[PDB]
């Protein structure tokens, strides 16, 4: 089994995914502003 540690593993992964969902959506909004012109 994977070692347990004081730092929350799933919390770190979840925060990475949320930060990857902000970058994606901001990039999509920028591309929409770029394409429509």
């Amino acid at each position: 089994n994977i070692a347990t540690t004081t730092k929350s593993r799933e919390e770190e992964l979840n925060k990475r995914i949320v930060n990857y969902k902000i970058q994606l959506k901001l990039m999509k909004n920028f591309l929409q502003e770029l394409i429509d012109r």
Binding site: F30, E33, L34, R37
Partner: protein, 292 residues
């Protein structure tokens, strides 16, 4: 029929201006038959006189271009012309001449290389290398002039002395430059179906890593050729300015289109995070590291 030297009709700034693809159909002056001459000394002197012009890439009365050489084709010009020796020459003189003919091939190939690769579209690295080739040719003609002077005034001069002198003086540097040039021609014609010169020199330098003179020459050539790239890198790291518009440098700053100027001015984050890139093709192994 009269003979004329007429003017031929990213611009090629060093391409030959006059026509040079003219190949004479028959000799303007009919010389003595080689079979008719039986003495060895006469044959040796005649072949020496014809060889002095051959070493510069010109035809002679007894050394003629092979029918395979087509001046129209670029690769044929770059690789240099192949020569055929008249069948009536003496066997020993024919062998010695066949060894020396290769020097005319290299010289003609380099001379035609300069008139092709020395323009803006091939970048600063290739241009600076063409500078080295042109300086080497200037040096080589001083080896040919001394040979001509000795042929004219020295009684003891003979074919073997010419072979030994040329092989021991200029063979090594000429071989290096010709091999690098032809390899560049092969790679550039493959890519059509810049900074790659440093890769070719480094690849070439592995085989001569134990040879002192060849390694010294290759290291000197690499040092002078790379100086432009070091200038670009130094300006980039000291003042944050890219200067040379040939897109040679690895750090590719790109211009925003006029149609999107107002958009990118508002969102400067994407301007400063997307329109600076690293051109991975032109990177050396030193910079082949993510953190660097």
């Amino acid at each position: 029929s009269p003979d004329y030297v007429s003017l031929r009709e990213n611009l090629d700034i060093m391409s030959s201006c006059i026509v040079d693809s003219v190949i004479y159909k028959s000799q303007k002056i009919a010389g003595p038959l080689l079979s008719q001459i039986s003495n060895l000394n006469i044959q040796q002197a005649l072949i020496i006189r014809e060889l002095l012009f051959t070493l510069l890439g010109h035809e002679g009365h007894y050394i003629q271009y092979s029918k395979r050489y087509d001046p129209t084709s670029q690769i044929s010009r770059i690789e240099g012309p192949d020569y055929k020796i008249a069948k009536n020459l003496d066997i020993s003189l024919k062998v010695i001449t066949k060894k020396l003919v290769k020097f005319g091939k290299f010289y003609s190939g380099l001379k035609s290389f300069i008139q092709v690769f020395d323009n803006n579209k091939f970048g600063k690295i290739v241009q600076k290398f063409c500078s080295e080739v042109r300086k080497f040719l200037s040096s080589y003609q001083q080896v040919l002039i001394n040979v001509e002077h000795e042929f004219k005034f020295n009684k003891n001069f003979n074919l073997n002395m010419l072979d030994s002198l040329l092989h021991q003086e200029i063979s090594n540097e000429m071989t290096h430059l010709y091999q690098i040039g032809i390899e560049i021609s092969r790679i550039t014609e493959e890519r059509q179906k810049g900074g790659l010169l440093l890769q070719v020199i480094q690849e070439r330098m592995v085989y001569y890593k134990g040879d002192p003179t060849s390694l010294d020459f290759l290291t000197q050539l690499f040092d002078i050729v790379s100086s432009d790239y070091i200038g670009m890198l130094n300006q980039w790291l000291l003042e944050g300015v890219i200067n040379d518009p040939f897109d040679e440098f690895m750090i590719r700053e790109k211009r925003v289109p006029d149609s999107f100027m107002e958009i990118f001015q508002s969102k400067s984050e994407y301007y400063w995070n997307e329109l600076f890139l690293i051109k991975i093709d032109g990177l050396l192994n030193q910079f082949q590291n993510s953190t660097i």
